[PDB]
Amino acid sequence: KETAAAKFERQHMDSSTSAASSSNYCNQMMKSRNLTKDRCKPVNTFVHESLADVQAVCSQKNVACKNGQTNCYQSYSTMSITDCRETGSSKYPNCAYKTTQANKHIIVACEGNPYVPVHFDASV
Protein backbone atom coordinates (compact mmCIF):
# COMPACT_ATOMS: atom_id res chain seq x y z
CA LYS A 1 0.00 0.00 0.00
CA GLU A 2 0.99 3.68 0.59
CA THR A 3 3.98 3.68 3.03
CA ALA A 4 3.58 5.52 6.35
CA ALA A 5 6.28 8.00 5.24
CA ALA A 6 4.39 8.63 1.97
CA LYS A 7 1.09 9.14 3.80
CA PHE A 8 2.82 11.78 5.98
CA GLU A 9 4.02 13.61 2.87
CA ARG A 10 0.58 13.44 1.17
CA GLN A 11 -1.29 14.67 4.27
CA HIS A 12 1.25 17.19 5.68
CA MET A 13 3.91 18.35 3.17
CA ASP A 14 3.37 21.34 0.83
CA SER A 15 6.86 22.63 0.26
CA SER A 16 5.71 24.52 -2.95
CA THR A 17 5.10 28.01 -1.40
CA SER A 18 6.34 29.99 1.70
CA ALA A 19 2.71 30.86 2.76
CA ALA A 20 -0.99 29.90 2.17
CA SER A 21 -1.92 33.34 0.64
CA SER A 22 -5.46 32.27 -0.54
CA SER A 23 -8.47 31.86 1.86
CA ASN A 24 -9.53 28.87 -0.38
CA TYR A 25 -6.05 27.14 0.09
CA CYS A 26 -7.50 24.57 2.52
CA ASN A 27 -10.61 23.82 0.37
CA GLN A 28 -8.36 23.07 -2.68
CA MET A 29 -5.48 21.31 -0.77
CA MET A 30 -7.80 19.09 1.36
CA LYS A 31 -9.36 18.01 -2.03
CA SER A 32 -5.98 17.61 -3.89
CA ARG A 33 -4.45 15.42 -1.09
CA ASN A 34 -7.58 13.10 -1.13
CA LEU A 35 -8.67 14.21 2.42
CA THR A 36 -12.34 14.89 1.33
CA LYS A 37 -12.91 11.64 -0.71
CA ASP A 38 -15.42 9.73 1.57
CA ARG A 39 -15.69 12.16 4.57
CA CYS A 40 -14.28 15.67 5.33
CA LYS A 41 -11.10 15.15 7.43
CA PRO A 42 -11.88 17.75 10.13
CA VAL A 43 -8.40 19.05 11.09
CA ASN A 44 -5.14 18.92 9.14
CA THR A 45 -1.83 20.85 9.12
CA PHE A 46 0.36 21.45 6.04
CA VAL A 47 4.07 22.31 6.44
CA HIS A 48 5.71 24.87 4.07
CA GLU A 49 9.38 23.99 4.67
CA SER A 50 11.58 21.77 2.51
CA LEU A 51 11.18 17.98 2.93
CA ALA A 52 14.87 17.92 4.12
CA ASP A 53 14.14 20.47 6.87
CA VAL A 54 11.07 18.45 8.07
CA GLN A 55 12.93 15.12 7.96
CA ALA A 56 15.76 16.75 9.98
CA VAL A 57 13.29 17.20 12.89
CA CYS A 58 13.82 13.48 13.60
CA SER A 59 17.34 14.41 15.03
CA GLN A 60 16.11 17.44 17.09
CA LYS A 61 14.27 17.56 20.46
CA ASN A 62 13.01 14.10 21.61
CA VAL A 63 9.61 14.39 23.39
CA ALA A 64 6.83 11.95 24.26
CA CYS A 65 3.99 11.62 21.71
CA LYS A 66 0.32 12.18 22.63
CA ASN A 67 -0.16 8.35 22.43
CA GLY A 68 2.66 7.89 25.10
CA GLN A 69 5.26 6.49 22.64
CA THR A 70 8.67 8.23 22.89
CA ASN A 71 9.60 8.50 19.16
CA CYS A 72 8.32 12.11 18.85
CA TYR A 73 10.54 15.07 17.98
CA GLN A 74 9.93 18.82 18.29
CA SER A 75 11.52 21.14 15.68
CA TYR A 76 14.06 23.45 17.32
CA SER A 77 13.00 26.23 14.88
CA THR A 78 9.51 27.47 14.09
CA MET A 79 8.20 26.48 10.63
CA SER A 80 5.75 28.03 8.20
CA ILE A 81 2.47 26.02 8.43
CA THR A 82 -1.18 26.19 7.39
CA ASP A 83 -3.82 24.91 9.83
CA CYS A 84 -6.93 23.63 8.02
CA ARG A 85 -10.09 23.19 10.20
CA GLU A 86 -13.53 22.34 8.87
CA THR A 87 -16.17 25.05 9.34
CA GLY A 88 -19.09 24.52 11.75
CA SER A 89 -21.51 24.36 8.73
CA SER A 90 -19.31 22.09 6.49
CA LYS A 91 -21.29 19.10 5.02
CA TYR A 92 -19.74 16.27 2.88
CA PRO A 93 -19.47 16.16 -0.06
CA ASN A 94 -19.05 20.02 -0.14
CA CYS A 95 -16.25 20.01 2.53
CA ALA A 96 -15.45 23.56 3.74
CA TYR A 97 -12.40 24.71 5.70
CA LYS A 98 -10.98 27.82 7.36
CA THR A 99 -7.36 28.44 6.43
CA THR A 100 -5.04 29.83 9.16
CA GLN A 101 -1.31 30.59 8.46
CA ALA A 102 1.15 30.31 11.45
CA ASN A 103 4.85 30.00 12.27
CA LYS A 104 5.10 27.27 14.98
CA HIS A 105 7.31 24.39 16.13
CA ILE A 106 6.06 21.04 14.75
CA ILE A 107 6.03 17.73 16.69
CA VAL A 108 6.27 14.59 14.54
CA ALA A 109 6.65 10.84 15.26
CA CYS A 110 9.61 9.32 13.41
CA GLU A 111 10.07 5.69 12.37
CA GLY A 112 11.72 3.44 9.83
CA ASN A 113 14.84 3.42 7.71
CA PRO A 114 15.38 6.07 6.65
CA TYR A 115 14.22 7.54 9.98
CA VAL A 116 11.54 10.00 8.86
CA PRO A 117 8.22 11.52 10.01
CA VAL A 118 5.22 9.14 9.90
CA HIS A 119 2.69 11.19 12.04
CA PHE A 120 2.04 14.84 12.76
CA ASP A 121 1.52 15.02 16.59
CA ALA A 122 1.00 18.80 17.08
CA SER A 123 2.20 22.35 16.47
CA VAL A 124 3.34 24.41 19.48
Ligand SMILES: [Rh+3]
Ligand atom coordinates in the same frame (compact mmCIF):
# COMPACT_ATOMS: atom_id res chain seq x y z
RH1 LIG B 1 -0.98 9.09 12.34
Ligand SMILES: [Rh+3]
Ligand atom coordinates in the same frame (compact mmCIF):
# COMPACT_ATOMS: atom_id res chain seq x y z
RH1 LIG C 1 -1.92 7.61 10.77
